[PDB]
Design a binder for this molecule. Sequence first.
Ligand SMILES: [Zn+2]
Ligand SMILES: [Zn+2]
Length: 227
Amino acid sequence: EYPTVDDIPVGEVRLYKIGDGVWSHIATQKLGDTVYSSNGLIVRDADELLLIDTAWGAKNTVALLAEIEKQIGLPVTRSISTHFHDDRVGGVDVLRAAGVATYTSPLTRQLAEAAGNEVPAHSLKALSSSGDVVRFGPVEVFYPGAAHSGDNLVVYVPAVRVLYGGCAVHEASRESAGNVADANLAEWPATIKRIQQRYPEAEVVIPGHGLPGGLELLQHTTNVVKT
Ligand SMILES: [Zn+2]
Ligand SMILES: [Zn+2]
């Protein structure tokens, strides 16, 4: 029942309930004759929502906001982008236009700028070194170290033990690492290990692209990387 590229008509966005007060959002995008799906997270905090990652571009992110209003009916007041690529910050200007306070780490803001990508407006402090963790509303934000990118963050929802790994984590069906142009393959194994050690009670692990699973996706990612 989890949405895939063959049930999402590009330009549209689906929500999938993961646990109490937690949804993933799923969208699709085409690069060079190739279409992908991409996930993000939505977390309720009292009567507002925290958004994790855009829906991969302006058009999709507009549709995301509409779908949130339709299905949940609470306002997105803040967002976090988990790295500097377009599937994470593409659509940040849509969020800004809608009045969302947009955040990411200082390093992600720098990399996004260098790349010519949209840049969240605000910095999350105290995430500069590997192992750094901060609280932000109903979640923890963790910088586990370099992996898919030098800046990649993970997000944990402690009340329901949901770990959003973003693109630092591969779905079970992936056999390759995908885009490694910004990756640190030598460091990726130790970064996963730091995630494993920090969140041993996670029940759901959500990858940046593809099907959610459990803690087994972490070791799987390490196995995929060793190529
Ligand atoms: Zn990426
Ligand atoms: Zn990605």
